Amino acid sequence: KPVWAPHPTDGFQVGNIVDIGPDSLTIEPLNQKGKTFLALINQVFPAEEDSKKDVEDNCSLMYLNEATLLHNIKVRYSKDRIYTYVANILIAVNPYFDIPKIYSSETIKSYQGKSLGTMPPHVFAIADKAFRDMKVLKLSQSIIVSGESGAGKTENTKFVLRYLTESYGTGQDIDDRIVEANPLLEAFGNAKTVRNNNSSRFGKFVEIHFNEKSSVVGGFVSHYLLEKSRICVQGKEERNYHIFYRLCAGASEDIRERLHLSSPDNFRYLNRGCTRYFANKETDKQILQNRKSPEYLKAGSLKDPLLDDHGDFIRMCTAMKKIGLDDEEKLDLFRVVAGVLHLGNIDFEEAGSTSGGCNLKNKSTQALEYCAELLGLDQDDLRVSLTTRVMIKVPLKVEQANNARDALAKTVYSHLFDHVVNRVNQCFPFETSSYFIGVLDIAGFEYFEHNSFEQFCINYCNEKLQQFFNERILKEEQELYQKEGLGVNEVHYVDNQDCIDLIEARLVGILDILDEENRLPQPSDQHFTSAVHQKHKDHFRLSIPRKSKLAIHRNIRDDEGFIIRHFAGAVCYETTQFVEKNNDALHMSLESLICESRDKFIRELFELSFISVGNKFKTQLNLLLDKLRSTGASFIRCIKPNLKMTSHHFEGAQILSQLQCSGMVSVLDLMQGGFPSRASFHELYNMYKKYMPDKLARLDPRLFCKALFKALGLNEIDYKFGLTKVFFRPGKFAEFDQIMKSDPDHLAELVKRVNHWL
Ligand SMILES: Nc1ncnc2c1ncn2[C@@H]1O[C@H](COP(=O)(O)OP(=O)(O)O)[C@@H](O)[C@H]1O
Ligand SMILES: [Mg+2]
């Protein structure tokens, strides 16, 4: 018989055991005879007999192991079937292309009210089960989309939101408003990175709120830590926020004239990264030459199946129009973006023998004049504010004034993003709700050749939502089966709590130590990294940069960084700028300048000075987890198929790692013997009690239940009685749902089914 043995690029490979050794097992690869390779007994797994067949729920496999899970997903993906279940947990593999019809209004309809497994695996099925559960259990529900940057969490978040609003959303205006919020938030909070062209530089929790009649009454979006660094500088293969690029590419000649824009290369805050636009043959025609940078003219447009800076400019303006933003609201946003750009251009030169600190360069006068009109400020008030920091006024050197000009741009932009999120929430408000369905789209786990505070926070976040997973799915589920007395085989796992204890320990964790450094008279990123390593050498999720597998990082000094061996893989961090990046506060000179601005819109944005970024984020996430622990949790596991952003290119070994890190290999072991559907046999009996005859009344609840299942052709293997509740095996969700249907015409109809059974 043929088995699954390891392969370096495919993850696994087919062949049969030809010989047994003390340490290992000699395997001969299938297709070609004679040639052999050796693999360990533990590294060898049984395969399915039918290699061509695919299953919708991995729990239906003959052999439930990491090699059979990978193969099922692989086959499904080749046939363009990106969704697969592991009981009620959905695995989504990024197609990197538009699969026709699978997100159509026809498909949306086909999924409505259908039980899990009575339709193919789909995000819609996860969204509908979460709606059924809300309506039935009278308990608010949470949808958690996980995966690394490029996995497909943002697209899947959007798919679910489109399903819910189209399905259970009135038919009125509010329904589409929740949908048109994402392209607006993506304009300001999404940017081209190397892992993803449409990367989410912020985390979000979108709640769809319902009344007791289970009809949408509005929504609420929560946002988490928009990347401030990206506003000023980027790397040649990455860009600033999409808004800058859509505006430069698609603005009417009047807007270009009014905002004083030109090709991205003229702007400091853009020209360090990519100055190329997302376009095709058609759209590249629609962008005027006075917007095209030399890089664009020499190398061409950036290619993307979904992104298009021109087509997305009109599409965002149309989203603003559909959510109630008038032409004034629109321009005010544009003036701030433009103001931020011109602000960036402002350059300084050493004064020495005049003021002491520095002045503004002679060719920075245009930038200053333009920046002032857009931000409703006096040019000199601005000129003073950037060159002299009062602390009794004090002058600033060239480097210090550069830091000042960037700090103000960052705050101004962030405040515009907080305004957009707010204005978005204002387009779908409500006085009160009963239950909600919230979708969690964090910023996915990322790492590059150079990793600072940004990555440390994004990954600390990814750590937290993975801790919620271990809790809900493995710790609590096994605890239930145990408390009820089912004797399901215990599954031990690689817990990610130690990593979190390392970061957020009150007074002695990385975050509270970093805070202490900011609070010192002369802070240091070197002194910071020292105290981190000195408290107290030992910890499994921490190592000095020279201990990295990648050559690149082995040149980093002990005090210059640290590696964090995360759940999703190890990431070496360069601790430079950590202290600075941990200060959310803005000097009061710049704070007062922008607050006392002759422009209402700018004033309205703004409603030792130190504010911890890290601990503000700890607080933010801890509120979210409380919100999350109160709801019923549903999980979507997005998988990135390759690192080349291509379709029909399944990297086996790469996906296998993702299946292992997400703990889906662990879940698969527990679902092999777990019962995902369950109900109290007394509450179930009491629900039917009003319509059952004396004969059925005299019987103990367990016996009526046993008879009702034995009427709906269930099997002794399918269900199992606990101490208080009845439990149901995977692939029996359809059955479980009808058994649980609280509708009196169904309940009484089922008593008749039972009566004839005897
Ligand atoms: N289900 C999908 N269907 C089509 N394209 C997808 C899908 N999921 C992801 N993509 C592609 O991958 C890109 C990035 O996916 P995204 O949703 O932004 O992932 P994440 O937020 O997890 O990094 C999208 O712009 C799109 O081109
Ligand atoms: Mg995203």
- What letter would DSSP give residue 276? P
Question: Which of 83, 84, 160, 198 has most ligand 1 atoms within 8 Å of CB, for mutation?
Answer: 198
Same domain, 38 and 117: no
Using alpha carbons, select from 711, 703, 698, 714 the residue that is nearest to residue 755: 711
Question: Alpha-carbon torsion 514, 444, 232, 619, what sign?
Answer: negative
- What letter would DSSP give residue 277? P
Of 607, 640, 660, the last residue of a domain is: 607
98 belongs to an annotated ligand binding site: yes
Using alpha carbons, select from 436, 448, 487, 528 the residue that is nearest to residue 209: 436
Using alpha carbons, select from 47, 96, 42, 38 the residue that is nearest to residue 71: 47
Q: What tokens does 542 get?
A: 């921490």
Same domain, 368 and 415: yes
User: Residue 437's domain is classified under what CATH number?
Assistant: 3.40.850.10
Using alpha carbons, select from 628, 572, 613 the residue that is nearest to residue 457: 613
Three-class DSSP category at 368: helix
User: Would the CB of 198 count as within 6 Å of ligand 1?
Assistant: yes
- Ligand 1 atom nearest the C-alpha of 157 is 17
Question: Alpha-carbon torsion 263, 267, 271, 275, what sign?
Answer: negative
Task: Give how far Cα 58 sits from Cα of 48, 85, 213, 625, 641, Å.
Answer: 12, 6, 36, 29, 19
How far is Cα 698 from Cα 685, in angstroms, rounded to an integer? 12
Same domain, 542 and 555: yes
Using alpha carbons, select from 113, 88, 89 the residue that is nearest to residue 168: 113
- Per the entry, the structure determination technique was X-ray
Same domain, 339 and 438: no
How far is Cα 466 from Cα 633, in angstroms, rounded to an integer? 13
Same domain, 295 and 439: no
Same domain, 126 and 175: yes
How far is Cα 483 from Cα 458, in angstroms, rounded to an integer? 36
Bridge-based pairing state of the strands 216-224 and 348-350 = unpaired
How far is Cα 627 from Cα 220, in angstroms, rounded to an integer? 13
User: Would the CB of 641 count as within 6 Å of ligand 1?
Assistant: no
CA atoms within 13 A on the CB side of 426: 9
The residues that bridge with 27 in the sheet, in sequence order, are 17, 37
Residue with CA nearest ligand 1 atom 26: 96
Same domain, 226 and 181: yes
Bridge-based pairing state of the strands 203-210 and 216-224 = antiparallel
197 belongs to an annotated ligand binding site: no
Q: What tokens does 64 get?
A: 């439930």
H helical segments located in 226-326: 229-232, 242-250, 253-259, 282-286, 294-299, 311-322
Q: How many domains, the chain?
A: 6
Per the omega criterion (within 30 degrees of 0), is the bond before 536 cis?
yes
A 10 A CB-CB count for 73 gives 27
Domain that holds residue 685: 675-758
Three-class DSSP category at 264: helix
Q: What tokens does 526 get?
A: 């070197």
How far is Cα 204 from Cα 424, in angstroms, rounded to an integer? 13
User: Residue 404's domain is classified under what CATH number?
Assistant: 1.20.120.720
CA atoms within 13 A on the CB side of 683: 10
Same domain, 54 and 23: no
Cα Rg of the chain, angstroms: 29
How far is Cα 164 from Cα 271, in angstroms, rounded to an integer? 41
Q: What tokens does 153 get?
A: 């969490």
Ligand that lies nearest to the alpha carbon of residue 189, given by its number in the listed order: 2
Residue type, 430: F
User: Would the CB of 212 count as within 6 Å of ligand 1?
Assistant: no
Three-class DSSP category at 387: helix
How far is Cα 281 from Cα 308, in angstroms, rounded to an integer? 11
Region of residue 74 (phi > 0: left; psi between -120 and 50: alpha; otherwise: beta): alpha
Of 272, 290, 323, the last residue of a domain is: 323
Q: What tokens does 68 get?
A: 């059979």
154 belongs to an annotated ligand binding site: yes
- Ligand 1 atom nearest the C-alpha of 92 is 1
- How far, in Å, from the CA of 568 to the mean position of ligand 1? 19
H helical segments located in 523-651: 525-533, 578-581, 588-595, 600-605, 613-630
133 belongs to an annotated ligand binding site: no
CA atoms within 13 A on the CB side of 451: 22
- How far, in Å, from the CA of 708 to the mean position of ligand 2? 46
User: Would the CB of 190 count as within 6 Å of ligand 1?
Assistant: no
Q: What tokens does 58 get?
A: 């991995």
Which of the residues are catalytic? Answer: 149-150, 154, 196, 199-200, 444, 446
Of 631, 665, 690, the last residue of a domain is: 631
Same domain, 121 and 155: yes
Three-class DSSP category at 317: helix
How far is Cα 348 from Cα 680, in angstroms, rounded to an integer? 72
414-418, long-range: CB < 8 A, 24+ apart: 414/226, 414/228, 414/231, 415/605, 415/606, 416/188, 416/333, 416/336, 416/337, 416/340, 416/605, 417/188, 417/189, 417/202, 417/223, 417/226, 418/223, 418/605
Region of residue 79 (phi > 0: left; psi between -120 and 50: alpha; otherwise: beta): alpha
H helical segments located in 470-541: 476-484, 497-504, 510-518, 525-533
Ligand that lies nearest to the alpha carbon of residue 103, given by its number in the listed order: 1
Task: Give how far Cα 622 sits from Cα of 475, 579, 735, Å.
Answer: 19, 23, 38
Ligand that lies nearest to the alpha carbon of residue 150, given by its number in the listed order: 1
Same domain, 648 and 544: no
How far is Cα 742 from Cα 684, in angstroms, rounded to an integer? 9
A 10 A CB-CB count for 713 gives 8
Same domain, 218 and 114: yes
- How far, in Å, from the CA of 144 to the mean position of ligand 2? 13
- Listed in sequence order, the residues at least 6 apart from 389 whose beta carbon sits closer than 8 Å to its beta carbon are 396, 400, 404, 587, 589
- Ligand 1 atom nearest the C-alpha of 195 is 23
Using alpha carbons, select from 714, 456, 404 the residue that is nearest to residue 561: 456
Longest dimension (CA), the chain: 105
Residue type, 320: M
The residues that bridge with 210 in the sheet, in sequence order, are 216, 435
351-356, long-range: CB < 8 A, 24+ apart: 351/395, 355/387, 355/395, 356/395
| Interruptions in the chain after residues (C–N over 2.5 Å) | 391, 607
- What letter would DSSP give residue 470? I
- How far, in Å, from the CA of 334 to the mean position of ligand 1? 27
What dihedral do alpha carbons 587, 588, 590, 596 form, nearest 10°? 160
- How far, in Å, from the CA of 203 to the mean position of ligand 2? 8
Place of tokens 């996995």: 151
88 belongs to an annotated ligand binding site: no
CB 249 within 8 A of CB 283: no
Tell me the angle at which helices 510-518 and 497-504 cross, rounded to the nearest 10 degrees. Answer: 20
Same domain, 269 and 376: no
- Please report which helix (H) or strand (E) contains residue 562, including its range: strand 561-566
- Listed in sequence order, the residues at least 6 apart from 345 whose beta carbon sits closer than 8 Å to its beta carbon are 266, 267, 268, 364, 366, 367, 371
Count Cβ neighbours within 10 Å for each residue of 374-413 and write b for 16 or more, e otherwise.
bbbbeeeebbebbbbbeeeeeebbbebbbebbbbbbbbbb
A 10 A CB-CB count for 32 gives 8
Burial class (CB in 10 A: 0-12, 13-18, 19+), 276: buried
CB 94 within 8 A of CB 651: no
Q: What tokens does 398 get?
A: 């060239």
Bridge-based pairing state of the strands 37-40 and 24-29 = antiparallel
